[PDB]
Structure formats: structure tokens, C-alpha cells
Amino acid sequence: GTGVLTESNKKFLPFQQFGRDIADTTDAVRDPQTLEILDITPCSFGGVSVITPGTNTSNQVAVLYQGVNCTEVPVAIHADTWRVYSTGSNVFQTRAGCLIGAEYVNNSYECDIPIGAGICASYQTSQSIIAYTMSLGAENSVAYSNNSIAIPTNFTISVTTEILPVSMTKTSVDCTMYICGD
Amino acid sequence: TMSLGAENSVAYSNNSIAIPTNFTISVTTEILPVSMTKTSVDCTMYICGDSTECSNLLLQYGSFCTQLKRALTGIAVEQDKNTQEVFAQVKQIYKTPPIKYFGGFNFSQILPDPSKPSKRSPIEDLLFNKVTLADAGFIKQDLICAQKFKGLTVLPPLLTDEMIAQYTSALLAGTITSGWTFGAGPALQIPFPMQMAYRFNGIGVTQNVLYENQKLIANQFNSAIGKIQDSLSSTPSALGKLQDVVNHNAQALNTLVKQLSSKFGAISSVLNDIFSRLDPPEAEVQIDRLITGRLQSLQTYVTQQLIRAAEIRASANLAATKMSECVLGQSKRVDFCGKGYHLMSFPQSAPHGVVFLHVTYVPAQEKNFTTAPAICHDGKAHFPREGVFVSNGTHWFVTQRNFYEPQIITTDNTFVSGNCDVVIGIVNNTVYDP
Amino acid sequence: ALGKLQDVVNHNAQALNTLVKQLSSKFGAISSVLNDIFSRLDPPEAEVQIDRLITGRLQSLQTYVTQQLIRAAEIRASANLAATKMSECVLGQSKRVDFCGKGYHLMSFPQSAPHGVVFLHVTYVPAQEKNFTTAPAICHDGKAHFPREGVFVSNGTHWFVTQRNFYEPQIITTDNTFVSGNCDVVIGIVNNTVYDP
Numbered sequence: 075g076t077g078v079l080t081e082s083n084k085k086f087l088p089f090q091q092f093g094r095d096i097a098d099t100t101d102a103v104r105d106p107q108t109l110e111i112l113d114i115t116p117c118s119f120g121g122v123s124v125i126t127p128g129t130n131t132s133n134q135v136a137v138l139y140q141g142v143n144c145t146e147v148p149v150a151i152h153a154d155t156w157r158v159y160s161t162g163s164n165v166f167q168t169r170a171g172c173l174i175g176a177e178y179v180n181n182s183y184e185c186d187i188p189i190g191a192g193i194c195a196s197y198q199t200s201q202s203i204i205a206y207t208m209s210l211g212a213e214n215s216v217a218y219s220n221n222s223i224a225i226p227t228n229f230t231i232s233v234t235t236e237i238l239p240v241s242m243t244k245t246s247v248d249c250t251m252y253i254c255g256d
Numbered sequence: 257t258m259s260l261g262a263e264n265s266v267a268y269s270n271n272s273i274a275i276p277t278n279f280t281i282s283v284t285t286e287i288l289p290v291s292m293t294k295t296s297v298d299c300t301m302y303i304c305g306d307s308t309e310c311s312n313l314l315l316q317y318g319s320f321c322t323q324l325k326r327a328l329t330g331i332a333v334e335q336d337k338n339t340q341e342v343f344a345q346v347k348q349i350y351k352t353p354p355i356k357y358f359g360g361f362n363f364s365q366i367l368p369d370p371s372k373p374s375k376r377s378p379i380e381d382l383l384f385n386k387v388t389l390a391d392a393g394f395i396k397q398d399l400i401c402a403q404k405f406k407g408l409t410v411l412p413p414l415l416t417d418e419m420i421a422q423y424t425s426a427l428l429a430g431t432i433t434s435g436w437t438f439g440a441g442p443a444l445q446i447p448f449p450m451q452m453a454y455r456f457n458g459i460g461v462t463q464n465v466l467y468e469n470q471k472l473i474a475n476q477f478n479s480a481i482g483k484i485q486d487s488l489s490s491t492p493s494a495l496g497k498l499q500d501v502v503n504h505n506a507q508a509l510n511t512l513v514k515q516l517s518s519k520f521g522a523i524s525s526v527l528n529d530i531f532s533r534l535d536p537p538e539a540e541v542q543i544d545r546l547i548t549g550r551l552q553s554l555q556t557y558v559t560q561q562l563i564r565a566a567e568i569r570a571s572a573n574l575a576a577t578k579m580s581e582c583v584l585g586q587s588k589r590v591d592f593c594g595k596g597y598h599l600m601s602f603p604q605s606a607p608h609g610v611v612f613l614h615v616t617y618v619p620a621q622e623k624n625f626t627t628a629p630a631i632c633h634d635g636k637a638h639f640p641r642e643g644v645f646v647s648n649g650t651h652w653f654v655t656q657r658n659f660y661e662p663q664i665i666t667t668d669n670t671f672v673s674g675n676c677d678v679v680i681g682i683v684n685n686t687v688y689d690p
Numbered sequence: 691a692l693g694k695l696q697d698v699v700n701h702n703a704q705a706l707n708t709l710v711k712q713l714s715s716k717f718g719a720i721s722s723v724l725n726d727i728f729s730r731l732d733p734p735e736a737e738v739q740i741d742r743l744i745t746g747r748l749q750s751l752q753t754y755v756t757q758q759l760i761r762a763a764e765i766r767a768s769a770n771l772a773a774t775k776m777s778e779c780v781l782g783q784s785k786r787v788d789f790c791g792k793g794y795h796l797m798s799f800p801q802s803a804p805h806g807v808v809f810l811h812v813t814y815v816p817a818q819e820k821n822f823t824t825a826p827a828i829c830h831d832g833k834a835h836f837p838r839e840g841v842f843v844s845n846g847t848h849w850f851v852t853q854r855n856f857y858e859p860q861i862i863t864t865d866n867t868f869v870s871g872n873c874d875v876v877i878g879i880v881n882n883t884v885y886d887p
């Protein structure tokens with residue numbers, strides 16, 4: 075196989091050799107010399123996701139790692155050449171992972187680049203790419219009272235558009251010549 | 257053999273009308289899925305796990321693994337848009353007034369609880385406890401570890417449940433304090449009993465009924481809400497419609513992951529075995545057959561994922577239109593917003609779905625009467641302006657159509673057109689003049 | 691603003707271009723060109739390698755069609771919505787809220803777009819609110835007086851009856867209020883004079 079040989083914590087039976095997961099992949103192996111449990115776990119991985127503004131605007135980017143405590147993405151470095159994203163200058167940990175190269179702001183605006191779990195980044199002001207928490211909308215508290223009614227005294231006619239697709243394009247394929255050219 | 261129902265028979269005749277003399281407030285329930293889990297898969301290590309040469313050979317097939325990822329990301333962003341359009345239909349974030357006395361109605365069971373750490377209503381908490389959902393992209397540090405080790409991943413929703421509950425509470429406060437005016441422009445406060453009087457007036461029942469049966473209506477509403485909580489708590493199969501989504505998603509993921517074990521006719525299901533214990537010249541062919549089988553499995557998986565995404569999107573559009581017509585207004589489309597004449601609706605969040613509480617009006621206690629289409633007073637037909645011409649006996653009166661309340665027949669609630677010889681069934685009666 | 695239709699066009703172009711790119715996939719065979727394969731193999735070997743390409747390109751075609759069927763189902767759902775709107779919105783006035791735009795519906799006008807339609811929903815939006823003091827009824831001679839259509843409203847001293855959507859104060863006469871009962875059972879009733887015309 076291939077993976078990190080790792081110190082195990084489970085127990086086999088006095089005769090068990092292999093250990094299997096649901097999809098019959100070798101989870102643990104009986105050590106050859108010593109009668110010790112040894113677990114085979116694929117060496118850690120995950121998607122690499124990159125947050126960018128338009129290249130028409132900038133060329134610096136943030137990088138989001140899905141499902142990592144951010145204490146292992148420096149563990150799994152390219153050495154073991156773009157380091158500035160593995161190492162911690164601006165490291166913010168969220169439910170989706172940690173995104174490096176983006177500054178966490180204690181404010182809250184509308185959403186531009188959805189990150190997940192309520193966080194979503196943007197590119198603002200001395201220019202950096204910020205990450206903040208979404209804002210639902212302007213706060214409001216209507217003045218309820220049991221002998222008070224608000225009646226409008228003026229109106230505004232307003233017209234809005236609504237785009238709707240109706241039909242797609244009608245294609246047609248030639249099985250014989252596509253599958254089997256001439 | 258199936259029984260279709262209590263076989264009944266209504267006593268039709270041509271001079272008889274049945275008018276209810278009482279009513280009943282009935283809170284119904286309706287549970288709708290909105291979104292599903294946002295999975296994402298990578299070929300390179302699902303198919304060719306830790307096998308550089310397998311990756312190099314998979315490079316030949318190539319363009320396939322951009323269709324897969326493209327479809328999956330489309331589905332994920334579609335789920336996010338579904339949630340946006342179902343819930344984010346309010347401009348501001350309204351707040352319930354600090355003091356709660358809405359004319360005797362008791363919304364304690366639907367408004368959020370500051371006591372809980374999560375500001376969810378008792379009903380929302382009960383729903384969340386009732387439905388058991390799998391890990392929603394929790395940071396790894398179970399069945400989830402099996403899938404997560406094959407490149408199969410679940411992304412977390414962009415809308416955390418707390419801010420979904422914030423949308424829900426904003427909608428509740430808006431519809432309680434303002435009415436339907438907050439969905440058609442700016443919020444306009446109005447006392448709740450007057451709002452509910454308008455809601456009666458919009459189903460053909462005058463408001464003098466509510467202003468005189470306010471206590472009964474409040475008590476019935478409170479008891480109905482309590483019974484809703486008890487019923488959807490005790491019965492475990494009440495909301496299996498949401499559990500179906502989670503079951504299907506986890507089940508498809510399990511089938512896909514353990515499908516990695518099939519050999520598809522090859523000598524072994526693990527590639528290093530084929531590479532060490534077999535000659536490369538046809539090892540290429542054998543592992544190519546394995547790759548074709550696994551690509552077929554992924555393609556099938558995403559085809560059912562796409563069909564189920566389309567069905568969930570249709571359900572989400574239905575939920576969004578129910579949120580618009582039912583919650584933000586008062587619909588006349590019968591059985592759209594619950595069995596009976598629609599009064600109000602109250603949204604309540606739930607995992608991967610939403611649940612409404614359709615308040616409706618149901619007549620209770622009928623009574624036979626003798627009716628006429630018109631009344632001939634001085635050789636002129638006299639039709640009812642609004643209502644019916646019932647009569648317990650020689651006492652012909654004019655009531656409204658949905659609640660028995662007799663009135664003397666005068667020239668104010670009666671309009672005249674014709675002579676009393678064209679109408680079949682006209683009845684001689686006096687029409688008092690004020 | 692109208693990228694919804696451009697999305698359809700782009701999806702169709704991409705879906706129909708991945709097929710054209712797919713022919714350059716050897717699919718486990720020696721090469722993805724039929725003539726070379728037939729010109730460098732004995733009849734028996736060719737069949738084996740060719741079957742690889744034929745089966746591969748067939749699969750690709752099914753993958754493309756199935757997705758076309760799914761997309762056509764989505765477009766049909768969208769087209770059924772458009773028809774419903776054109777009928778209840780362009781050919782009538784709708785009472786379903788947020789169906790024909792936000793606000794109370796007035797009119798709608800269709801305009802033709804490439805592979806789609808766009809509507810111009812003419813709505814009505816109240817603008818300038820004004821706090822008032824209201825009551826459910828008006829006890830005059832011991833009898834409650836409920837508004838025939840509208841709400842009771844006072845500007846601080848006098849009481850009026852106005853519409854529910856536009857401040858239009860009126861003197862309270864007996865031609866716009868209906869009597870129902872006596873004034874000891876409704877909570878919130880207030881004294882006032884109801885004019886007799």
C-alpha cells in the first residue's frame with residue numbers, strides 16, 4: 075500500500091492480522107516482528123480552494139483548506155515553494171477550514187465571495203482581501219402598540235423587470251460519424 | 257379490501273340551506289424540504305488512490321472529471337440559492353416588541369427563547385431534536401471517516417442555523433406587529449385584534465364576529481398551538497419527509513464508497529496487487545477496465561444526484577411560494593395554505609427544510625333553514641345585497657353566508673330589480689322601510 | 691442584469707464543446723484515430739482496440755444526452771412558469787403577493803428576449819406613513835358602530851374613518867358605519883358622535 079505508518083490505539087484478537095474499514099480497505103496491519111497493532115491511514119489531504127478578486131482588479135489571493143485544524147497544513151508542507159500560505163501570517167480558522175492570506179475583520183458587510191458557515195470574504199482597503207461575517211440586513215424595530223395604526227398618505231408607482239428563460243437550443247447529433255469518423 | 261372513507265349522504269332539497277352557527281380555529285402543519293447536503297468528490301484519489309501511474313493513465317480519459325466537479329458545484333450553489341430564496345425575503349430584521357400582549361393571543365411557543373443558548377423557539381428546538389442529521393462538514397480531527405478518506409466530502413451550508421432562525425424570527429415579528437404590509441413595502445404597525453378582524457373580513461365574515469368572540473378565538477388559538485407541539489412531539493413519523501433526504505444522501509454515499517470494492521472482472525480490486533503480481537502489458541488493460549467501471553459508478557452517482565437536486569429545487573420553489581402567498585399575505589386559493597379558510601401562517605425553521613403553521617377557520621355547528629332566492633314586496637323582486645334569505649318560520653330574515661346572524665330585511669341590505677313573476681321560487685314577504 | 695439567459699447559452703455551448711474535445715481521448719487504445727488503428731493491426735487485434743473507442747464514444751454520447759434531458763426538464767419548468775405569469779399577470783391583475791413583483795400589482799408588459807421573455811411589473815408602493823390613534827368601534831347611543839370599509843382614526847381630537855391604504859379622512863356618518871350590538875362587549879370601544887345625514 076501507501077500511507078503514513080502510524081501508532082495505533084485499537085486492539086485486535088490474539089490471531090487477527092488485518093483491519094478493514096467499510097469499503098474493505100486495509101485499516102490496520104499486525105506488525106511482523108512484534109505482536110503490535112499498526113494502523114494504515116492515508117496521509118492527510120483535502121481540497122485546496124482559492125479566493126480571488128478579478129485579475130482585472132488584483133492578483134493577490136487567499137487560499138481556503140477544507141477540513142483541517144490549520145495546525146496540520148504547516149505539518150504537511152511542500153518541503154515534506156509557495157510557503158507564505160502554509161505558514162501563519164494571517165491565519166483564520168473557521169468551520170470550513172482556515173483561509174490564509176485574508177484578514178479577519180470584526181465588522182460585518184453584505185456578502186461578496188461565499189466561504190461557508192456564515193463567513194464570506196471581500197477585497198477592500200493599503201489594499202488587502204478581508205474576511206468577515208455576513209450581515210442579514212439593516213436592523214429594524216417597528217413600534218407596536220395596541221391603539222396605534224400607521225396609514226400611508228402618498229404612493230410611488232414602481233416598475234421592475236423579471237428575466238425568465240423559455241426555450242433552449244435544438245441540437246441534433248449524427249451517431250455514426252461522431253462515434254465512427256468516416 | 258381498502259375502505260375509502262365514511263360513506264355519507266347530504267340531504268339535498270331545493271328550498272333548504274345549512275348555515276353554520278359557530279366556528280373553530282384550526283392550526284394545521286405542513287413540512288417541506290428546502291435543501292440537501294452539498295457533497296463534493298475528487299476522481300484522482302477515489303479511483304487511483306496512491307498510484308501515480310494510475311493517475312497518469314487516468315489523464316487519458318481526462319475531460320470526464322471536469323463534468324463531475326462542474327455538476328457537483330452547480331448542485332451546491334443551487335442549494336445555497338434555494339435557501340436564499342426561501343428565507344431571505346425580508347428587507348430589514350424586525351424585532352418583537354419588549355412587552356408581549358397581542359390582545360390575548362399567546363405566541364410564546366413560536367417566538368424565540370432568550371433562555372436557550374441558541375435563540376430558537378420551543379417548536380424549532382423540538383424539530384431539531386426530532387430529526388437526526390449526520391455530520392454537516394464538521395472539522396475532522398464513524399462512517400464519515402470512511403467516506404472522507406476516499407475524496408468524498410460534504411461542504412457546510414453557507415447559512416448557519418442560527419441566522420436562519422434570525423430570518424424566521426424577523427418574519428414572525430413582521431407578520432405579528434405589522435401584518436401583511438411589510439411584504440408589500442414598508443412595515444405599518446397595527447393592533448393584532450384589528451389585523452385578525454381584517455383577516456376575518458377577507459374570508460367573508462364580518463369583523464363584528466371577532467370583536468365579540470375575541471376571547472373564544474384567543475383560547476382556541478392557544479389550545480391549538482399547544483396541541484400542535486404535543487402532536488408533532490409524540491408522533492415520531494410526523495416529519496419523515498425531511499429524514500428521507502438525509503437517508504437518501506447518506507445511503508447513496510455509502511453505496512458509492514463501498515462500490516470501490518468490486519473488481520469489475522479484474523484480477524484484484526487493489527491496484528498495487530495488479531502491478532506487483534501481474535505483467536504490465538495487460539496490467540494496463542486490467543486497470544483501464546477498473547477505471548472505466550469506477551468512472552461509470554461516479555457518473556451514475558451524479559446522475560441520481562442531479563435528478564434529486566431537480567426534485568429538491570421544485571420543492572424549494574413550492575416552499576418559497578408558500579412563504580410568499582401564505583405567510584406574507586392571505587390567500588384565497590383553497591387548500592393551498594391548509595384545510596379550511598386561511599387566516600395566517602407562521603414559518604419555523606428545521607434542518608434542511610421549513611415547516612409552516614397554517615391557521616385556518618372551520619365552521620362547526622350547522623342548522624337547517626328554509627331559503628328563497630328573492631322576495632316580492634310590492635310587485636318587485638328583492639334580492640339580498642350580501643347574504644341569504646333564510647327563515648326559521650314565517651320570520652324570513654337575511655344573514656351573512658358564513659355565520660348565522662339573522663337581521664330584519666330592510667331596504668338597506670336589499671336591492672330591487674324586476675317584477676315578482678320572472679324568478680322561479682320568489683316568496684311573498686314584507687320589506688321594512690327605515 | 692440578464693445573465694440568466696447567458697447562463698443557458700454558455701451551458702449549452704460548454705456541454706456541446708466537451709463532446710468535440712472528447713474525441714481526443716484514447717480511452718485505453720493505442721491512439722484515438724481510427725485509420726491508424728486499422729492500418730497498423732491484424733483484423734483480430736484491431737477489433738479489440740476499436741471496441742475500446744466505440745464503447746468509449748458511445749458512453750460519452752449517453753452522458754451528454756442524459757444531461758440534455760435534465761436541462762430540458764429544467765427549461766420546461768421555467769417555460770411553464772412564464773406561461774402562468776403571462777396569463778394571470780399580462781392578461782389579468784393578480785392578487786397573489788410577490789408573484790408579479792413586490793408591491794400591489796397593477797399591470798405587466800412582456801418583452802421578447804433571445805431564448806426567453808422579460809416582464810415589466812407595474813406595482814404600487816405606499817410611501818409616507820403617519821402614526822394615528824385607532825379604535826375598533828364607536829359607541830354612540832349604547833350601540834357599537836363598526837366601519838363599513840376602512841379604519842377608525844383620530845388626529846388627536848376628532849375621529850375619522852379612512853381607507854386602509856391611503857389617508858383619506860371622512861366624517862363618521864351612518865352611511866359608512868354599520869351597527870352591531872351594544873357597547874359593553876367589545877374591548878377598546880370609544881365614545882363619539884356618529885352623524886345622521
Ligand SMILES: *[C@@H]1O[C@H](CO)[C@@H](O)[C@H](O)[C@H]1NC(C)=O
Nearest residue numbers: 104105106107108109110111
Ligand atoms: C524478531 O527478533 C526480535 C529480536 O529479539 C524478537 O523480539 C521478535 O520476536 C522477532 N520476531 C518474531 C516474529 O519472532
Ligand SMILES: *[C@@H]1O[C@H](CO)[C@@H](O)[C@H](O)[C@H]1NC(C)=O
Nearest residue numbers: 142143144145394395396397
Ligand atoms: C483542533 O480543533 C479544535 C476544535 O475542533 C480546537 O479546539 C483545537 O484547539 C484544535 N487543535 C488541537 C491541537 O486540538
Ligand SMILES: *[C@@H]1O[C@H](CO)[C@@H](O)[C@H](O)[C@H]1NC(C)=O
Nearest residue numbers: 219220221355356357877878
Ligand atoms: C394596551 O396594553 C397595555 C398593557 O398591555 C394596557 O395597559 C392597555 O390598557 C392596552 N390598551 C388598550 C387595551 O386599549
Ligand SMILES: *[C@@H]1O[C@H](CO)[C@@H](O)[C@H](O)[C@H]1NC(C)=O
Nearest residue numbers: 226227228229230231817818
Ligand atoms: C407625493 O409624493 C410625490 C413624490 O413622488 C410628491 O411630488 C407629491 O407632492 C406628494 N404629495 C403629497 C400630498 O405629499
Ligand SMILES: *[C@@H]1O[C@H](CO)[C@@H](O)[C@H](O)[C@H]1NC(C)=O
Nearest residue numbers: 277278279280472476620621
Ligand atoms: C361555540 O363553540 C364554543 C366551543 O368552541 C362554545 O364554547 C360556545 O358556547 C359555542 N357557541 C354557540 C352559540 O354554540
Ligand SMILES: *[C@@H]1O[C@H](CO)[C@@H](O)[C@H](O)[C@H]1NC(C)=O
Nearest residue numbers: 361362363364365378478482
Ligand atoms: C403563554 O403560553 C405559555 C405556554 O407555552 C405559558 O407558559 C404562558 O404563561 C402564557 N402566557 C400568559 C400571559 O399566560
Ligand SMILES: *[C@@H]1O[C@H](CO)[C@@H](O)[C@H](O)[C@H]1NC(C)=O
Nearest residue numbers: 266267274621622623624625
Ligand atoms: C337537516 O335535516 C336533515 C334530515 O333530517 C339532516 O340529515 C341534516 O343533518 C339537517 N341539517 C344539518 C344540520 O345538516
Ligand SMILES: *[C@@H]1O[C@H](CO)[C@@H](O)[C@H](O)[C@H]1NC(C)=O
Nearest residue numbers: 647648649650651652653662
Ligand atoms: C324565529 O326567530 C324569530 C327571531 O328570533 C322569532 O321571532 C320567531 O319566534 C322564531 N320562530 C317562531 C317560533 O315563530
Ligand SMILES: *[C@@H]1O[C@H](CO)[C@@H](O)[C@H](O)[C@H]1NC(C)=O
Nearest residue numbers: 269270271627628680681682
Ligand atoms: C323542488 O323540486 C320538486 C321536485 O320536482 C318540485 O316539485 C318543486 O316545485 C321544487 N321547488 C321549487 C321551489 O321549485
Ligand SMILES: *[C@@H]1O[C@H](CO)[C@@H](O)[C@H](O)[C@H]1NC(C)=O
Nearest residue numbers: 632635676681682683684685
Ligand atoms: C303574493 O301576493 C300576490 C298578491 O298579494 C298574489 O297574487 C300571489 O299569488 C302571492 N304569491 C304567493 C307565493 O303567496
Ligand SMILES: *[C@@H]1O[C@H](CO)[C@@H](O)[C@H](O)[C@H]1NC(C)=O
Nearest residue numbers: 216217224818819820821822
Ligand atoms: C410612530 O411612533 C414611533 C414611536 O413613537 C416612532 O418611532 C415612529 O417614527 C412614528 N412614526 C412616524 C411616521 O412618525
Ligand SMILES: *[C@@H]1O[C@H](CO)[C@@H](O)[C@H](O)[C@H]1NC(C)=O
Nearest residue numbers: 844845846847848849850859
Ligand atoms: C384634527 O382635525 C380637525 C378637522 O376637523 C381640526 O379641526 C383639528 O385642528 C385637527 N387637530 C390636530 C391636532 O391636527
Ligand SMILES: *[C@@H]1O[C@H](CO)[C@@H](O)[C@H](O)[C@H]1NC(C)=O
Nearest residue numbers: 829832873878879880881882
Ligand atoms: C362612554 O360613555 C359612557 C356614557 O354612559 C360612559 O359610561 C363610558 O365610561 C364611556 N367610555 C369611556 C371609555 O370613556
